[PDB]
Design a protein around this ligand. Structure first.
Ligand SMILES: [Mg+2]
Ligand SMILES: [Mg+2]
Ligand SMILES: [Mg+2]
Ligand SMILES: [Mg+2]
Ligand SMILES: [Mg+2]
Ligand SMILES: [Zn+2]
Lengths: 66, 82, 177, 101, 114
RNA sequence: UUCA
RNA sequence: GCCCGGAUAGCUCAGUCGGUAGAGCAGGGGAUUGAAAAUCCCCGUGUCCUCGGUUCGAUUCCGAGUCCGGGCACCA
RNA sequence: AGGGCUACACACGUGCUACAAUGGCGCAUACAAAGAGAAGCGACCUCGCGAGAGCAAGCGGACCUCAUAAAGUGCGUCGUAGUCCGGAUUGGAGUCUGCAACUCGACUCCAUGAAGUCGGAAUCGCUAGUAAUCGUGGAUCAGAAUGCCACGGUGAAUACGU
């Protein structure tokens, strides 16, 4: 790489919705709390069902006519 | 919004159709009519063709499109501006 | 990138034994990944390019190369030698790091994702697709940005066949719809 | 006078008052602390939504009796303003007459 | 004065100068002042930095300036991401809460430029 | 000042 | 080649010794009339031909030009 | 059966709230009328900021219900300021009723709470309890109008003249 022409290139952790540590050597520069990793994300698995959040379906099943 | 004591509401035709959907495949959407229906868990993942008054236009159900009603994504008037 | 060593052991451990090869060199491999935004409408707004290429600088790690048009046409009003598009070629551990980031923290974050195509190939294993909800990458703040421009991204492989392309993609499991 | 709408009205009203007191004990299930809040008042709304819409105490129109005029109805006489004034000026209506004060 | 990063006025009775927060109207104002436990119409100038600290740890219970900023941000972006009737009214600059448009609704409408 |  | 004159809004034009854009026309909306005219109320409308230096500050002072007009001009 | 009649670069006519110190809000307390009501009115009583939920008498009635009239007055606070003025605008959390409140309701709760600093040419109404304001109710009403109709409290200005 040419020196002093590219964005910062620090290494960052896969700060997912559950915190599965899958480090990323990226440009974001911060441990961006994302959703997308083995823990807490869909297509990190088949037959997707996000386990339990505040989200929508959680409070919907909380009211639900319970 | 709906009275909480009454809980949600949804018409049984769409209810049972989307039950069959979550059961045995969903490659096809649902050609419902009941725009007012509460989005349930077992509708997520589909691309339901919700009625706009003349057409049953598709809308994919997302985990955020759960606390809503079906018609909310089928606009009813073709707006173009002046 | 861990994905490169994942390759170095597992992907050969799969492909050598599947396609019953007679060399590790004979094993198909990925060499470069070129990302591109062929903006085209930036003919009017000069600043849209700097607006556009900023995503390559963000999504990819390298300050992009802005590509200049090749022929002044009549159909799109463009003049030859004009800042029409932008690209980033990612190879080495840069390629592997970006591909890890992609397939892990951005690809599954695609909304309404029935999956990728199983046919996007030139006929010579060099895969090529294109995303449109680019903010799926956590590299975009998507709140101070201007537009939601997509791109088209190609993965050049040494696989001289589309079957070998499918195999080398499913190596890293490549949703494939 | 488009008698079809008057017949609509009488049909809806007759059906509603025949199914009377059924939707009553269906809807009462929905406002009370019983039903486990998940089963009985839940199947009650299904029962209701299956029930005829043409048989509710609200889907009717409350049209007149003379010629079923849509607007201007008056529950006190079941007539439009027009025909109640006609009956008044005819003397049909007991106690009715132009008043001032 | 400095609480929540904002600079609420001085010589302005606390029960009203508390409301200077983008995220605290009169309701949260009275509630926070009661939960902290100070007299009503005292001017903010007569309130010590320790009183500011009590009010700080108390407003640390309610939503605050930047919290409400990002909250309204995320809510409207949620409506957008859904792309519903409400989200489209938002994005196209029209009334949202179900009103008439043809003549009134000038706030959602804009000025009379053309 | 005009209508017509 | 000499002296003079000018360009200003969407058209007709003002004024400059620097403190700063006007009016008519115009268009659009409105008011009045039974209806429109005129009228009236409003709004719109300027990078002052162009570029450049001068002074706390320019259409205005200057330089350097773009045109257009007038008058006078060398006999390669 | 859904949809729209509730669309919206835009003009115009009504009416409501404002742009506030005779005024903003808190406390205290009082002075009216006109009604309406039987799947209706709903007492009292507990809870929920609160919509209301529950309980659910009496009332086809000079008897129970809507029932605080408000504007008022006393005390207080605000202190001439996009204000402690507004309250539209949105976000979220509900209540109601309706088979059903997304398009397309009223109400309640939380927070930003906006143009708005008395309005141009012009133009409307009003001669007395009249306008000006303040609140009240009824019909239409499954719900749902600032609308319509009706009610009652304060309560003036100027008429020289054609
Ligand atoms: Mg280099
Ligand atoms: Mg409509
Ligand atoms: Mg206020
Ligand atoms: Mg008179
Ligand atoms: Mg009316
Ligand atoms: Zn996780």
């Amino acid at each position: 790489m040419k020196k002093d022409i590219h964005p910062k290139y620090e290494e960052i952790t896969a700060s997912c919705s559950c915190g599965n540590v899958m480090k990323i050597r990226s440009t974001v520069g911060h441990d961006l709390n994302l959703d997308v990793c083995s823990k807490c994300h869909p297509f990190f698995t088949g037959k997707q069902r996000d386990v339990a959040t505040g989200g929508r379906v959680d409070r919907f099943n909380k009211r639900f006519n319970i | 919004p709906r009275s909480l004591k009454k809980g949600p509401f949804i018409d049984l035709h769409l209810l049972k159709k989307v039950e069959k959907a979550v059961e045995s495949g969903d490659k096809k959407p649902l050609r419902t009519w009941s725009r007012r229906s509460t989005i349930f868990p077992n509708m997520i993942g589909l691309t339901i063709a919700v009625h706009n008054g003349r057409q049953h236009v598709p809308v994919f159900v997302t985990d955020e499109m759960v606390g809503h009603k079906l018609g909310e994504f089928a606009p009813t008037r073709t707006y173009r501006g002046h | 990138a861990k994905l490169h060593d994942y390759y170095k052991d597992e992907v050969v451990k799969k492909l050598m034994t599947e396609f019953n090869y007679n060399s590790v060199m004979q094993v198909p491999r990925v060499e470069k990944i070129t990302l591109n935004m062929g903006v085209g409408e930036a003919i009017a707004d000069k600043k849209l390019l700097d607006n556009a290429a900023a995503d390559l600088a963000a999504i990819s790690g390298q300050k992009p190369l802005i590509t200049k048009a090749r022929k002044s046409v009549a159909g799109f009003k463009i003049r030859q030698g004009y800042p029409i598009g932008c690209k980033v070629t990612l190879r080495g551990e840069r390629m592997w790091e970006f591909f890890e980031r992609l397939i892990t923290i951005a690809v599954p974050r695609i909304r309404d994702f029935r999956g990728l195509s199983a046919k996007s190939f030139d006929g010579r294993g060099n895969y090529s697709m294109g995303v449109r909800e680019q903010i799926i990458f956590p590299e975009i703040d998507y709140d101070k940005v201007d537009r939601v421009r997509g791109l088209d991204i190609t993965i050049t492989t040494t696989a001289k066949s589309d079957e070998e392309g499918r195999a080398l993609l499913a190596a890293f499991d490549f949703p494939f719809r | 006078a488009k008698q079809s709408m008057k017949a609509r009205e009488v049909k809806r009203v007759a059906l509603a008052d025949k199914y009377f007191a059924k939707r009553a004990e269906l809807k009462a299930i929905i406002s009370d602390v019983n039903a486990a809040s998940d089963e009985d008042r839940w199947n009650a709304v299904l029962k209701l939504q299956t029930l005829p819409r043409d048989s509710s105490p609200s889907r009717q129109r409350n049209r007149c009796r003379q010629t079923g005029r849509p607007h201007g109805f008056l529950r006190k006489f079941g007539l439009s303003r027009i025909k109640v004034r006609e009956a008044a000026m005819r003397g049909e209506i007991p106690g009715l007459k132009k008043a001032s004060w | 004065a400095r609480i929540a990063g904002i600079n609420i006025p001085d010589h302005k009775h606390a029960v009203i100068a508390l409301t200077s927060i983008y995220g605290v109207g009169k309701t949260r104002s009275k509630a926070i002042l009661a939960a902290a436990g100070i007299a009503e119409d005292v001017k903010i100038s007569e309130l010590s930095e320790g009183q500011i600290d009590t009010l700080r740890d108390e407003v640390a219970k309610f939503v605050v300036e930047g919290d409400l900023r990002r909250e309204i941000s995320m809510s409207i972006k949620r409506l957008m991401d859904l792309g519903c009737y409400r989200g489209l009214r938002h994005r196209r600059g029209l009334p949202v809460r179900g009103q008439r448009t043809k003549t009134n609704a000038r706030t959602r409408k804009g000025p009379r430029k053309p």
